[PDB]
Every structure is written in C-alpha cells, then in structure tokens.
Design a protein around this nucleic acid. Structure first.
Ligand SMILES: Nc1ncnc2c1ncn2[C@H]1C[C@H](O)[C@@H](COP(=O)(O)OP(=O)(O)OP(=O)(O)O)O1
Ligand SMILES: [Ca+2]
Ligand SMILES: [Ca+2]
Ligand SMILES: [Ca+2]
Ligand SMILES: [Ca+2]
Ligand SMILES: [Ca+2]
Length: 903
DNA sequence: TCAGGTAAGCAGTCCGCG
DNA sequence: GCGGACTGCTTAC
C-alpha cells in the first residue's frame, strides 16, 4: 500500500513524523528537513520558478529550518519579499506525499477517553490537580476495546471491585444498563493505589499511543488533569511521556477567577468532540453537557444518580464506574451517527495538513492552494500584515410585514463559490479595474458595459477569462464533492418519505428490512416490495434512511462550509491571499445578482399575469427570492383543485417549466453584461408554501428582515408526507428561548399557518392557564456568559452590566462558602430567571450553569421567588405579539360590539 | 501558534422626559 | 413607562 502520515511536528531543526509504511506498519522518524524559500531575481535568466504573477524567483535551499527562519527575518529588515511556504511541516508533508493520499482508517489509532476525579472541595481544577484520578476509561479503535482503570483505594474511600454482571442488568433491576453490544469489549483493571494505576496507564499509552485523541471536553479537563496529576506525583518529564516525542507546551492564561491550562502534546492530534460538534453539527445548543447532547442526538435518557457526584464513588462505586464507561461509549455513538472524525480525516488528508488544523479553513486553504501551485512550479507569496477593515456583504430586502398566503422561493446554488467560478476571481487572475458607477445602474442594465475583454464584478474589478485561477480550480473540486454528497442526502430524504407513506398500511407479517442503498432513489420494484412489509421492518428502514441522510448532511454541509470559508478568508487579514478587491468582488456581484433577478422575476410574472408594476417578489436575502403566488393561484381559481397536493403539483410545474427558464434567461443576460468566463448562476425552486386546502390557515407571514414562517409542502423536490414548518429567525429558532416557550410558539405558529385565528386563540388560552405548572428549567432563558470579570466589582453589578451577567453575579453571592455549588465558566451558557421585588437574593434575576439543576441549597428560594408574570410576558407574549400583529391576527379576542350577546 | 466573512433583529442599560 | 443611542448575543445568509 501507499504510505501516509499520522502526525507531523517541527521541534528543532527536526521534523518528527509518525506514519504508516508500505506494509501497513506504524512507524516514527526524525528528519533533518532542508527547506526551500524563494527570492525575486534578475529575469534574466534561466530559473524554472516563478511567483503567481509570473515574476522570476531564485530558490534558496537551507541547511536547516532555523537558518531559513533567520533568513526570513533579514529579508523583512532589508525590505524584500521572502517567498515560499513558511510553515515548514506543510512543506515537509507536500514533499513527502507528492500524490493523492489514500488512507486506511483501520490503521489510524483513534482514542476516546474520560476520567473521574472525586473532589470533596468543589470542581477539581486541572491546573492544580490536587485530587486522585480514581477512574479512566480509554477506548482504542484498533483493539475495539474499552480499557477501564479503576481505583479501589483512595483517601476519599475504599471500595469493592466493579461488577460487569451488575453493570449489564436493567436499571429497573438494580443494574446500570451498560449496553449489551459493548459488555464483551470491556477490559477491566482494578488498582489498590493511584501510583500503580497511573504508571500502568502511561505504560499502556506507550504501547497504544493515540494518533487522534478525542472525547468530551478532553482538551479542557481530561488531558490537562492527567498531565498535571502525573506531573505532581512523578515529575514533569514523566508527564511528558504522554507525548511520543516527549515534548509539550503549557499555555496558562490567568485570573481573576481564575487560572486554566491547555497542554499541547507534540506528536498527537487532539480533536475534542465538543469542538467537532460545535464546528460541524450546525446546531446551537442551550447546553453542552454530554447528557444534554446525547439525549438530543440519540434519544437516550440521562445518566441518573442520587446525591452529588462528589459522593457518588463512595455511595455507589458500581454505578460510578459504569457511568464512566457509558459516557465514553456515548461519544462513540454520536460519532457513529455524525461522522465528524471521518470528515476530519477526509479533510486533513485532502489538504495535507495536521489533522487538528481542520478547525482552521485558513490553514486548510493555505495548504490546498500551496500544493496546487507547487505542482505548477509556482512560488507562493509571503504573508503580510494588514489592518482590519470593515467591508460590505450581502443585500437583504425590506419586506412589508404581512401574512402571505401562497409562497414560492428560489435559491442560487452555492452562490459565493459559484461567483468565484463564474467571474474567475483569484489573486493571480486580476486583469485591472474599470470606472464603477452606482450599483443601482447595473441592476437596471443602464450603466455602460464594464468591459468587452475581461470578466467583471460591479465592484470595479476585471479578471482574465482565458487563464484560470488557483482559487476557482481548487474551489470547483470541493464544490463538486459537495453536490455529490448533497445528492446522497436528498435521495435518502426522499426515500425517507416513501417509507413514511408506506407506514400508513403495514402488513400483518414477519419479515426483514430490505437490503438497499439509501443514497439512491428507490426503484419501482423496491417500492412494490415495500408495500408488502410489516411496520417493524418499515420502521427499521426509516431509521437506516435517516442515518444515511444525516451522514450525507455532514459530508455536504461541511464541504459547503469549507468553500464558503474560502470566500470569507479573502477578507481575513491572516489569509495569505487576503484581498478586499476580491472579497468585495464576490459580495458586490452577489448584491447585483439578487436585485437583478428580483427585477427580472417581477418583469416576467407581470407579463404572464396580464398586469403592470405589481410586486411579486415579497422578500430576498443574499441569494434567495420569495414570490407571492396568490395571483398565480387566482388566475386558475381555488375553485377548482381536487386537494392540497393538486395545487402543489401545479406550482411545482409552473416553477420548473415556466419560471426557471425565465430566470435562466435573466442570468445569462447578466453573465453577458459582466462578460463573465462561465455562466453558473443556477437558481432553482426551493420551497412551495401555503395553507391546507379549504382551511382557515394563513400559509405564511413575515415580521421583518430574517424573520418569517412558512407552511411548506415541497422542499427541493422532496414532497412531504405531512406539511413542515419552515421558521427562520423567530424565537422558536433561538437557543436563548426557553424550551417550553419554543414549543408553545411553534404550536402557535403551526395553528396560525394551518388552522387559523380561532385555533390560535384556543391554544394561547390553554398555555396561559398552564404556564405556572411547567418545570422551571423548561421556562428558563439561556445566554452565553462572556466578559464576566469586566462587570464584576465585586461581587456586584458594574455599569452597563448585562441582565444575564447580573444574574451570574447574584448566583455567585448566593453560593459563597458552601462548595457543592458548581461555578459558572466564562464563555459557557447559563440558565436565566427573573426574580420578584423583595427576594432574599437581593436582585432582579439569577443565573446558573445550563444543562444543570440549580443546587438544592438555593433551589427552593428560586422556585418561590421566580417571576412567572415577567417570564411569560418577556418570552412568550411579546414575541407572539410581534408574530400576530404582523400577520393581522389577534391571539386573544378584541373589542367588540358583539360582546353583549349571551344574556 | 494562535485568526472565513457581513447583515441584521431583539433584549437589555442608560438617559431624557413638568 | 417607553423612545433613541449604545452593548451583547444570536441567527440568516
Ligand atoms: N457559514 C457561512 N460562512 C460564510 N459565508 C456564508 C455562510 N453561510 C452563508 N454564507 C454566504 C455564502 C453563501 O454562498 C451565501 C448563500 O448562503 P446559503 O444559501 O446558505 O448557501 P449556498 O447558496 O452557498 O449553498 P446552497 O447550495 O446550500 O444554497 O451566503
Ligand atoms: Ca463523569
Ligand atoms: Ca443558496
Ligand atoms: Ca437549492
Ligand atoms: Ca402495505
Ligand atoms: Ca439561501
């Protein structure tokens, strides 16, 4: 097999590389890497190497990396460009793997672990590590085994051995319900003392050295705790045995609360699962506890125990150990669904970077482009300092707040990347400039044609159309991958709706789920076989389909993120190819395109509907338009349709057969105007929206920019079994909105759109009466807690202190002394509740860490003093007032003269 | 060794307001 | 008690 790296590191004048050799063996090597950089030279003659602008460069081969760094400094002091790849390990990887890396994941050691540390005096701070590690579960992906290290003897208690027979039993039978499919995979190892545990753990780590280290919050807890604990007992160089190159970096950041540590383990690639989750999940969660995310992702119940965790080991060591193991397995289960580690490996190896750099699209794209240009023997430019400058982005149309009955939307595919490809925007393809003119003049096709020679953006820039650029070339490759995965995603989605329709008529039989590839639309014969299946097998098939759809989602949305990040990176001062000319060429062209097609769509629909000056496009954001279809429906009559599906088929046909060609004509004209290299503005129908036929629902409404709701029947070719709410921007979509309020506002919205005003009043009435009965956690608001120190005096509110920060400070006073109370972590989310005037807490609100119950010592007072009236008014009524007044609806009955008609 | 982007809504603080 | 000028946070793209 072809070799591939595992990790790369630069230590001195040495590169340290772990790799997989041609026999599939893991090896490590130290290489005295001799790097090259470049300098502009005469011309004039005979070089071979050219910078991206075509200017000749001479190659400087250095005896070591130190010398090449020093030479870089001298060139700066002289005032001359030092060209070439200055991150030498990227250069090393590029030289050593000069071919497309095909990797074998079964040879890459991916380690999942977590530790337990009993602490009788508050959170065990890793930077201190003054309490014993009493449990480690470490899952190795090569062995497919959970290695459990369990401390029996501790200054905080002596316990008996953990029992695997008890662990396996149902919780209802006194066991721990450790999943059956991992019971045979546990290798349990008890210890009579912590030193022997830690020694054995380090020895184990030498034999089975992680390449990818992950887990839940391992970067901020597990890793620094283990490092500092070992350092405190054995000395630092023993703790350095966690690095295979025996090299670590300890970054501090201190006070005032206050002091944490991130340990860098050279020769390892840490990918904390919380960081993967945050970057790649496209959720915003009110909490990032593992219980919370596990529930969300897997529908598993929280790991229940009695008493504080500080006492769990001594009261129920059996459960303590089992939960340590289960928490490790849960991260694996989430990864099985989400596939972020796969994504990371795919991305790292494609780009030729350290795997942990997949977090940085700038590092990722510097490597991709570097590698692309090196193949053509071109020399990359030096990175320069730039001052940060604000610049213009997208256009958002101001909508008339109203109800909108029948709505069709249309969207440009992968817009910013498509603009880069269409215009040919790249650092080395800049042709020149032209005299601009106001954007409005281009939108209305009245401005002078920018050029008849070069490809243009309305920001003033001209690009060559016969050369091709590194950015369009490399962005097209990732884009093409994205659309493939999006196709798998959508097919799995459509196939999912086929199973759901079939679930209306399950057969009374005993059978098996079909063996099919959910990435491809079902064939007629698979569809027939499905009509004969039992519910149990259909439900199994739906779950597999949905998993296929999630997998596709991860693959496609994150490739989308990578290419969109290339367009933004052009506007970041640390990007080697930073250039506001290019960044604004994308955003300004985008602004023109949306408004251009608004005009063209208004022009087309006025023609076909025999009218003039009527506004069909009711709204647009960045690359999308929303078209009122009321008049289209009216021209035929609601009379008249057989059912809901009938008018949806009609709008679908009208969008596909009439509107899309008119749109395509509009954009081809715009491509001609801008004299672009390639037409790539592909605007396809997205959603079909409206009420159920013969109901009183309003179909949709807008309240303002980025705030609307639609009752959607078809979405990108997926015809739903049951209509789905597309809600954007509203409080239902925000993580700061209390759980039960999200749920209540959604049902309020559902009733408005599908059922009508009357139904809405019914529900509101009930929710208002029942509000005070809801659990306090479900009605708490959530907020991130940044910049706490700034506003602390303390421990009282400073000037302009935000509400949520005020509540934290109130919490911090209420939990002085007694240490069973968990502390608020800077940058993390908190629950927030208003308090009634005169409360014993001495302020208008309180806040505590989200995902958790408020400590039992103050919980009773919070519950007694919670201001329900203010809660309901702030979180539910005020938002609902916004929705209903926009939609010309009332959530409770108004006037009226009729009032006096029951006696 | 640290670094995709901008547009834009709403909650809240401070202040003005016989 | 509720507006405008700010900060903070959060979402849509
Ligand atoms: N996370 C982001 N980072 C940077 N730019 C973004 C991001 N999301 C959206 N944009 C910008 C670039 C996009 O091309 C443009 C339109 O957004 P959007 O419609 O969500 O995706 P898209 O048009 O790129 O892909 P799709 O094919 O899924 O429609 O807005
Ligand atoms: Ca734990
Ligand atoms: Ca789009
Ligand atoms: Ca689309
Ligand atoms: Ca059937
Ligand atoms: Ca869009």
């Amino acid at each position: 097999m072809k070799e591939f790296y595992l990790t790369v590191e630069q230590i001195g004048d040495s590169i340290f590389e772990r790799y997989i050799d041609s026999n599939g063996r893991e090896r490590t090597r130290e290489v005295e890497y001799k790097p090259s950089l470049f300098a502009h030279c005469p011309e004039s003659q005979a070089t071979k190497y050219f910078d991206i602008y075509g200017k000749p460069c001479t190659r400087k081969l250095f005896a070591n990396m130190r010398d090449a760094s020093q030479w870089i400094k001298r060139m700066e002091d002289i005032g001359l460009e030092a060209l070439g790849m200055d991150d030498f390990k990227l250069a090393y990887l590029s030289d050593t793997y000069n071919y497309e890396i095909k990797y074998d994941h079964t040879k890459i050691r991916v380690a999942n672990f977590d530790i337990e540390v009993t602490s009788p005096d508050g959170f065990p701070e890793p930077s201190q590590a003054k309490h014993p590690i009493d449990a480690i579960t470490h899952y190795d992906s090569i062995d497919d085994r959970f290695y459990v290290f369990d401390l029996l003897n501790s200054p905080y208690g002596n316990v008996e051995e953990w029992s695997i027979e008890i662990a396996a039993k149902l919780q209802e039978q006194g066991g721990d319900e450790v999943p059956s499919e991992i019971i045979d995979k546990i290798i349990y190892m008890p210890f009579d003392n912590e030193k022997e545990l830690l020694m054995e753990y380090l020895n184990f780590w030498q034999q089975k050295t992680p390449v990818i280290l992950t887990g839940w919050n391992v970067e901020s807890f597990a890793i620094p705790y283990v490092y500092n604990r070992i350092k405190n007992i054995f000395g630092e160089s023993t703790a350095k045995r966690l690095s295979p190159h025996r090299k670590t970096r300890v970054k501090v950041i201190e006070n005032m609360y206050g002091s944490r540590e991130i340990i860098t383990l050279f020769g390892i690639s840490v990918l904390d699962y919380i960081d993967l989750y945050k970057k790649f999940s496209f959720t915003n969660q009110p909490s990032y506890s593992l219980d919370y995310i596990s529930e969300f992702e897997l529908n598993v119940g929280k790991l229940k125990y009695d008493g504080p965790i500080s006492k769990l080991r001594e009261s129920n060591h059996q459960r303590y150990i089992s939960y340590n193991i289960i928490a490790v397995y849960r991260v694996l289960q989430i990864d099985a669904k989400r596939q972020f580690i796969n994504l990371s490996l795919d991305m790292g190896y494609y780009a030729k970077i350290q795997i942990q750099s997949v977090f940085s699209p700038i590092k990722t794209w510097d490597a991709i482009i570097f590698n692309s240009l090196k193949e053509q023997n071109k020399v990359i430019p030096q990175g320069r300092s730039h001052p940060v400058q604000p610049y213009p982005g997208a256009f958002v149309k101001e909508p008339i707040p109203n109800r909108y009955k029948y709505v069709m939307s249309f969207d440009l595919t992968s817009l910013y990347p498509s603009i880069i490809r269409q215009v040919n925007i790249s650092p080395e393809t800049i042709a020149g400039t032209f005299k601009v003119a106001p954007l409005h003049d281009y939108i209305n096709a009245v401005a002078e044609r920018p050029s008849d020679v070069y490809s243009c953006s309305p920001n003033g820039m001209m690009y060559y159309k016969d050369r091709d650029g590194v950015v369009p070339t490399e962005i097209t490759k990732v884009f093409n991958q994205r659309k493939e995965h999006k196709g798998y995603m959508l097919a799995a989605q459509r196939n999912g709706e086929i199973i759901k329709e079939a679930l209306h008529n399950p057969n009374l039989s005993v059978d098996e789920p079909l063996d099919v590839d959910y990435r491809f639309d079902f064939s007629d014969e698979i569809k027939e076989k499905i009509k004969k299946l039992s519910a149990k097998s259909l439900n199994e098939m739906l779950f597999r389909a949905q998993r296929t759809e999630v997998a596709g989602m991860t693959a496609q949305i994150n490739r989308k993120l990578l290419i969109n990040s290339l367009a933004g990176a052009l506007g970041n001062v640390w990007f080697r190819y930073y250039d506001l000319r290019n960044a604004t060429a994308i955003t300004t062209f985008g602004q023109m395109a949306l408004q251009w097609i608004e005009r063209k769509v208004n022009e087309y629909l006025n023609e076909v509907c025999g009218t003039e000056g009527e506004a069909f496009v009711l709204y647009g954001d960045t690359d999308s338009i929303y078209v009122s279809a009321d008049k289209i429906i009216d021209k035929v009559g609601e009379s008249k349709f057989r059912d809901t599906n009938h008018w949806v088929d009609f709008l679908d046909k009208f969008a596909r057969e009439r509107m899309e060609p008119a749109i395509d004509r509009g954009f081809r004209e715009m491509c001609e105007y801008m004299n672009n290299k390639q037409h790539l503005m592909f605007m396809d129908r997205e959603a079909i929206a409206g009420p159920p036929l013969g109901s009183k629902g309003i179909g949709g409404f807008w309240t303002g920019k980025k705030r609307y709701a639609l009752n959607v029947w078809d979405m990108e070719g997926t015809r739903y079994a049951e209509p789905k709410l597309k809600i954007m921007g509203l409080e239902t979509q925000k993580s700061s909105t209390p759980k039960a309020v999200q749920k209540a506002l959604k049902e309020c919205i559902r009733r408005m759109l599908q059922e009508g005003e009357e139904s809405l009043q019914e529900y509101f009435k009930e929710f208002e009466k029942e509000f005070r009965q809801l659990n306090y956690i479900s009605i708490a608001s959530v907020s991130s807690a940044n910049n706490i120190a700034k506003y602390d005096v303390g421990g009282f509110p400073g000037p302009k202190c935000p509400f949520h920060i005020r509540g934290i400070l109130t919490y911090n006073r209420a939990i002085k002394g007694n240490i069973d109370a968990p502390q608020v972590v800077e940058g993390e989310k908190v629950y927030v509740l208003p308090l009634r005037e005169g409360n014993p807490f001495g302020d208008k609100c309180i806040a505590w860490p989200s995902g958790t119950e408020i400590t039992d010592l103050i919980k009773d007072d919070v519950l007694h003093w919670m201001d329900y009236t203010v809660l309901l008014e702030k979180t539910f009524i005020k938002p609902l007032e916004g929705f209903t007044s926009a939609a010309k609806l009332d959530y409770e009955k108004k006037a009226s003269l009729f009032d006096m008609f029951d006696f």
